[PDB]
Amino acid sequence: RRWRRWWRRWWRRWRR
Numbered sequence: 001r002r003w004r005r006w007w008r009r010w011w012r013r014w015r016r
Helices: 002-015
Strands: none
Touching: none
């Protein structure tokens, strides 16, 4: 899932 790659990036960046 190519989008999940960025998904966890976003998560770890923004949320914590």
